[PDB]
Amino acid sequence: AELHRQIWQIANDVRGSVDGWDFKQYVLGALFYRFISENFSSYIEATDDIKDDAIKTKGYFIYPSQLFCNVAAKANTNDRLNADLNSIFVAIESSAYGYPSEADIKGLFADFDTTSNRLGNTVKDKNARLAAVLKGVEGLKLGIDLFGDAYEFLISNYAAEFFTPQHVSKLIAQLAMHGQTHVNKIYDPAAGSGSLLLQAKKQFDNHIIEEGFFGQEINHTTYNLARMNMFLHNINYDKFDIKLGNTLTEPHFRDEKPFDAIVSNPPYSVKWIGSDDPTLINDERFAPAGVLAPKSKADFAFVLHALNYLSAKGRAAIVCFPGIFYRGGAEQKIRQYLVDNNYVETVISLAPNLFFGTTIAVNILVLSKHKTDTNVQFIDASELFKKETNNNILTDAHIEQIMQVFASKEDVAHLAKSVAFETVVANDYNLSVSSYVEAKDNREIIDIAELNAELKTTVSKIDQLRKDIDAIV
Amino acid sequence: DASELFKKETNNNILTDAHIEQIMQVFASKEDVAHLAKSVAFETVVANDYNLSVSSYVEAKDNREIIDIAELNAELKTTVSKIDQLRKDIDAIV
Amino acid sequence: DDPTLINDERFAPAGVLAPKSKADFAFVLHALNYLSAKGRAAIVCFPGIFYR
Amino acid sequence: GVEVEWLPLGEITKYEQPTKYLVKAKDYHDTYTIPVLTAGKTFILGYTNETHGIYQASKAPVIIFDDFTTANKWVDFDFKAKSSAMKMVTSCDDNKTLLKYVYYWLNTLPSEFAEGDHKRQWISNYSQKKIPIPCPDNPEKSLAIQSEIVRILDKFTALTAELTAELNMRKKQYNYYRDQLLSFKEGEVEWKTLGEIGKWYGGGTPSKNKIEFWENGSIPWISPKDMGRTLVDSSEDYITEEAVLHSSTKLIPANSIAIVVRSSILDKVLPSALIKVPATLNQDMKAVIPHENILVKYIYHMIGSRGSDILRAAKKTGGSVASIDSKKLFSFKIPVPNINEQQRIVEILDKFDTLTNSITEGLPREIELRQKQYEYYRDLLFSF
Amino acid sequence: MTYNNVFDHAYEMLKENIRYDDIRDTDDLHDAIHMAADNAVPHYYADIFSVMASEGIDLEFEDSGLMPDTKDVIRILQARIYEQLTIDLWEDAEDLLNEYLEEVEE
Amino acid sequence: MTYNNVFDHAYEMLKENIRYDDIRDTDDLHDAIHMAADNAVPHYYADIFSVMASEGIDLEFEDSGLMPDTKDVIRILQARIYEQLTIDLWEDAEDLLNEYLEEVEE
CATH class of the missing domain: 3.40.50.150 (Vaccinia Virus protein VP39)
Known part of the structure; x- marks a missing residue:
């Protein structure tokens, strides 16, 4: 309607190239990594430099760990990690999911991001496929914070088993x-x-x-x-x-x-x-x-x-x-x-x-x-x-x-x-019987529906007689 | 077969x-x-156009009727139906 | 053919050779190869041959 | 009925589950003898009757179908089967009920029994109540004043049965009349190949991928879900007049015929229809027009008399959903006589089948109008 | 998602009914069979197709009258499941005529 | 045993027909569609049920007249598969109006 057809279609285009239930985990994980990469950056800029650096000054680091508790880095975000296109190897992101889910101070709601996995058949194919996934998530474009609404579409991949319309x-x-x-x-x-x-x-x-x-x-x-x-x-x-x-x-x-x-x-x-x-x-x-x-x-x-x-x-x-x-x-x-x-x-x-x-x-x-x-x-x-x-x-x-x-x-x-x-x-405690109001209520008049058939039979008698005559050819 | x-x-x-x-x-x-x-x-x-098969496929369920045995019975039932129409026209007043 | 077996040892009397999805009639072209003049072949096929 | 009172249903009814059924050997051919009856149409083909624990369906029990359906009523008329859907409704006292009467009463409650809504069993629904009984006139003159109305309802149910019988025999004699007459025409009548009667068209089919090609429109659509009729003047599907931009169709004239060549023949007999409005059809059926040396009813009824012959000589054409070929239905030859023997014999034949068939000047329409007034006269009688 | 999963559900539910109702008349036992039967059939599309691709149950019939003369295909399939389960609950009724009711004597 | 396996077979067979016959009239192209369509449908019970439990194809209809008015259930299911495949071969016809016939010019 507004942009939902385009976002709809580009979200469905990502779904290659094998079965979608297993790739669903990876697609949503990469999308969520993109969202944290946008959110934490937009927090800490709140203002001059897009490209950050290892200037962390970790006495300051506990303040968003209390405020947000997804405190990754300044150089290990999706804008930063997806600059390493087709870079050997995979497990860097498995390290880049190791520490931001640690964050044990306080009241975690972590122990979370452990659905991205390794298969795959060969490790070069795994590297190429995950680079394709991060490529396709990069290809999604916001162009202000309803970018996650497409997520609500994407969990509706199967429902168009149990995800409540x-x-x-x-x-x-x-x-x-x-x-x-x-x-x-x-x-x-x-x-x-x-x-x-x-x-x-x-x-x-x-x-x-x-x-x-x-x-x-x-x-x-x-x-x-x-x-x-x-x-x-x-x-x-x-x-x-x-x-x-x-x-x-x-x-x-x-x-x-x-x-x-x-x-x-x-x-x-x-x-x-x-x-x-x-x-x-x-x-x-x-x-x-x-x-x-x-x-x-x-x-x-x-x-x-x-x-x-x-x-x-x-x-x-x-x-x-x-x-x-x-x-x-x-x-x-x-x-x-x-x-x-x-x-x-x-x-x-x-x-x-x-x-x-x-x-x-x-x-x-x-x-x-x-x-x-x-x-x-x-x-x-x-x-x-x-x-x-x-x-x-x-x-x-x-x-x-x-x-x-x-x-x-x-x-x-x-x-x-x-x-x-x-x-x-x-009742016998039933659910429901009452009321169920009695639709399709119809009946007829007494003799309007019989004299027309009587007239058609009077046509039918002379048609029988024409049939008895016309049988001799 | x-x-x-x-x-x-x-x-x-x-x-x-x-x-x-x-x-x-x-x-x-x-x-x-x-x-x-x-x-x-x-x-x-x-x-043929080299087909498999068309011939022979022998022509089962072979049936037809006699000329006028299947019309005079319906004619007699309609002669019953006319007086039933008349009984219907009378019996509508209750 | 994917190989050069259009000019093979056994499918040459067929003239043309069978495509992918209609491989059943490959077997009958194989069938008359391994069979003497005394021999006879009893194979089975799908019915749906008009001329294919 | 002087004292008309309501009575409960389960007071005078033994309602039970059937006995031990063993009805399936792996054949139930025509050569067997018992009437096998279930819901829907009450005739499945026969079975060996003897020694299967058979209830043998004596004088006046009745039945009810079904679990989750709860609508169907049939009388075991003389002697029938028990074929594993027949939940038995009968009586323990036979001096009051005479339960052809309760068949003649029970079909007058459409307020709930015509509601197939849930997967629900309804034993208590038609088990408990009610029924109109002339109690307390039992047993002296209770059924004696009901003898007039059992005369009424026996003769009216017999009217429905004999009307179906005479329509069957009428179509029987008419089908042999189509083939004794109008065939082997002598001599010698010119054999015209089909398609030389007129330049006929292929078809044309859009899809539902564009909503704007589907919603509105005044050109009707001829699909085989609206086929099987005689003298089709409109249909359930209308196609958009704009949508012939992307339909692959042609405008056919107002006296065409439409014939199905797929999904009906190779097992059954193909119907045909005179089509009177200009209406388009899909890929797998044919719109045929005549031309200048013709009469459209004569070519229509010529194919309609010879329908079983155009499905024989090219019957298989590959074991598929494809059927009698387009060319092998195009290349059939029909007798086309002199100009004194088109309009005369098809005047006879149009005459006789607009007599015998639906809708106007129709015998089965008389039958369902008698069914309507049967329901109405049972509505009128059974009140007090 | 076998046929036998559904039959195990029906077997367990029929044991529940006979165990908690103490039904010793075979006609009321078969009414309890009709109770358990539709209460054990599945409802989802893929579950019903995975049961119909499994063993035991066959596409062929015991009574064609159980088919509703209509264009509702999974109603017909579910009726077929109902029919095969009614046969298998005749067999289960033959089991439970002597399985549980004999022990309960106190 | 997806629906898409059967659609890949039909796509390949339609490519074979158009590639080896050089059909450039759309009505004869759709006759070749009718050729490939039933020649690509499966035949086994469990295969047809596993296709019907898969995506793309739905139990609902495009034309109820393709249903034979009979008690042959897998004939009706196979007709439904035929119908969904005819729609998907309309789409494939839209693809192959411009896919292969353009390159063959020598």
């Missing part, structure tokens, strides 16, 4: 909001990417700045790209972290705090051996559930985790698979404990697909420790601009309408509405 | 199908078979 994330951000101008936001179990956290307060930075975007994530390589994902978008140093590990088995923080807003997108089929394999049937958090979730239905573990880290002011906007009828007795009483209180506020259906190949839609559970009280089973299939999402890249202004009619307790036809507070206890 | 060629499976008759036996048997001495292939001319394929 952007406007649905904007919906979840508008659902954790609002009416709460309160520290802190935000929490996320199983963040995966840093996306659905990032599109919350990057729009709301001018609104408020409170505390960290506390996340915990399982995969090792996803952990690093998330920690640079929130690093590229000018978020500061101190608070804004992800912890590696399973959210279920090793949660932290327990202590800090019952939050004000959690968002999530737990991946489907994230099973864990139970039930429980440890003695956490009598744990600190799953005791109000009664029974605990088995292996293959681990999604409803997250919601039992969700109401833990949440204050009375807080609300939770999570997503789940649609296929809950009552899910056996293993989750019927779980659904019961959810509807035991005013924990569950609303649910929202979506439009299939609006993902990358599922081809189904999913449900959005909105939870609160808040009392009115009746449930608004606020489903939708359309609209929900089901046709695409390529139009209106900035804002659809359409989830705007959805949030708007969510905002004040409406009762809408040809769209969902509220229901009774005990309709679902009259 | 397309059948038979016991197309249904090959799990039956693990030892010998005794069916390629028949195929080899009719191959063995220069037959000319219908509902199965046969010999052709030595210059039929130079009359």
Whole structure:
């Protein structure tokens, strides 16, 4: 639109010349090295000399190590290292990733840049390929600080597996909001990417700045790209972290705090051996559930985790698979404990697909420790601009309408509405049945659709007679 | 050949199908078979564009009908249909 | 051919020689080589020959 | 029905899973005997009936399809199979139900049963409730006042069956009428090679790579997803009038015909269509025009009578998605008689197939309009 | 991503159902089979294709009526997976008629 | 066993046809496209499923009429592969209108 087609195309041009998942690590690492090379230089010039030198005066060096904690050099940046075109050898950059990830003073958020590796078949081919990678990253051109936004495109290489499309994330951000101008936001179990956290307060930075975007994530390589994902978008140093590990088995923080807003997108089929394999049937958090979730239905573990880290002011906007009828007795009483209180506020259906190949839609559970009280089973299939999402890249202004009619307790036809507070206890605790308003309503008049066929049969009799005559040729 | 060629499976008759036996048997001495292939001319394929195969491909599913057996029954059903139209025109008032 | 085997020992009675993707009919040109007047060859091929 | 009351469905219904099915040997040829029936169209080809644990489908149980579908209804009419999709709906009491009645009632709830939305089983949905019953008139005159309406619905369902039967027999006699008549024409009628009837055109196909060539437009598009019809006047796809800058098409006149030469024949019989608006078609079908010594309906129905002959003599042409060749469909010869035997015999033939077929002056359109008023008269009767 | 991964999920889930519900009537056991069956099938494109390129399951049918007469291809493939899993859960039902219900006597 | 492997086979075979036939009329070029297209598609089960789980090609359609109205699933999948390859050979035709025919002048 503005420059996004050109940046789009030149970013896709980099993707040679073998499989893209392995090269994804290297491309993002070189791009991130370029970003630190621009950021640290633009910091320290804040003014005369582009080309610096080893004039470090290392009593001064601890001040940005406290301020930024990516304190590399003055002669070992990407503007400086990519002047050594096709220079034997590789491992200089493996040294140039050794020390800037040391920086142990204080409160690291390092131990980070260890995805750039060596394969490759021969070492000269490795040197040539990494020189090609740094060449292609040099070929990218800024031409003021949204140069990392193309990163948001590039992690969308596969989604055009699990990296959460952007406007649905904007919906979840508008659902954790609002009416709460309160520290802190935000929490996320199983963040995966840093996306659905990032599109919350990057729009709301001018609104408020409170505390960290506390996340915990399982995969090792996803952990690093998330920690640079929130690093590229000018978020500061101190608070804004992800912890590696399973959210279920090793949660932290327990202590800090019952939050004000959690968002999530737990991946489907994230099973864990139970039930429980440890003695956490009598744990600190799953005791109000009664029974605990088995292996293959681990999604409803997250919601039992969700109401833990949440204050009375807080609300939770999570997503789940649609296929809950009552899910056996293993989750019927779980659904019961959810509807035991005013924990569950609303649910929202979506439009299939609006993902990358599922081809189904999913449900959005909105939870609160808040009392009115009746449930608004606020489903939708359309609209929900089901046709695409390529139009209106900035804002659809359409989830705007959805949030708007969510905002004040409406009762809408040809769209969902509220229901009774005990309709679902009259149901078998289902999700959803009500309302699902009854489209395609048609019937006919009594005898308009028969006299025309009668006249056509009166034509058909003389056509039968012409047929009986004309058979003799 | 397309059948038979016991197309249904090959799990039956693990030892010998005794069916390629028949195929080899009719191959063995220069037959000319219908509902199965046969010999052709030595210059039929130079009359063709050297094709593999076109001849013979013998012309299965050969069916046609009689002249007027399939029309008088429909005529009688339409004579039923006229009085059913009249019963329809009467019975619309309830 | 990539070598000079257009003038080889066995594919000369073919006239032209088979390209890359249609290598099946190379085998039949190999087949009549190693076979006496008494011999017979029972090979298999793809059906899709009109004249290729 | 004096006292009309609502009753639950599971009060008078034994709804069960089928028995032990063993229906797959690796052949179910025409030479077998049992009626094999499933969802969609209720006829899969026959199977050996005896000794398979067969339920043998006695007098008046009915069935329901399917898991995740929950819509289809069929009566096991005389004696049928149990072929591994037939969840059984019947009764334990037979002195009240006479459950052809409940088939004649149950097709009057389209408010939810026509909603294929989830991967959801719905046993409780059609298991619990409701049904209209003339209770408490049981068992004296409960079904006795229903005897008038079972006469109505038996004769109307029989009307639908016999209309399908007479349309089948009508097209049968008409197909033999196309080939007894109009063939072996004597003597001797001139054999004209196709394409000498008129200079016909190749095709032409853009892609969706430019949105401006796809969105609007008034020239229709003839693709084989809109083919198979008779006297095509419009289509679902319209192409842009500007987009013939990059279409590789030609403007064909307003009395052309369109014939498919790919993806239908080599297995099935090719259809053809008189095309009346100037509309363009893709690479793998042919727009044929006649010229000056002709009648477009005569060449149309000449190819339509001889469709099974133009797929035989050049049937294979390589075992591929390519089919009966462009030249080998170009080089067929048809009888073209004197000028007294074009318009007369095709007046007969156009006459008779605009009688027998869709849409206007159509027998199956009468059939679906009788289906519409069948639904409406069941809507009108079953209220109180 | 074998067929046998999905069959192991279905086997485990069927053990969960029979173990926690104590079902001893075979018709209700097969209703629990219908419960576990669609609850064990995958949902992603590449997962379903990698299962269909694996062993055990075949493209051929046991009942063509399970195919929806429609142009939704992975619905048809998922129905085929459902069908092969229903057969393999007939076999699993023959296993669990004598596997777990015999020990529970106290 | 990507989609792009099959597309490379089709690209090479189309280069063979245009290089050895010297076709300079675009309708006969697209007839050679129809020649190369089915001659490049795979035949095995697992190969076709591994192509269908790959990039580029999608389950969605360009023309539903290419689907045979029948219960032969891999015929429908192979028709879908044929359809995506015909689109990609429109693009390849746009390439080879100016790739090879210009150099051959002697």
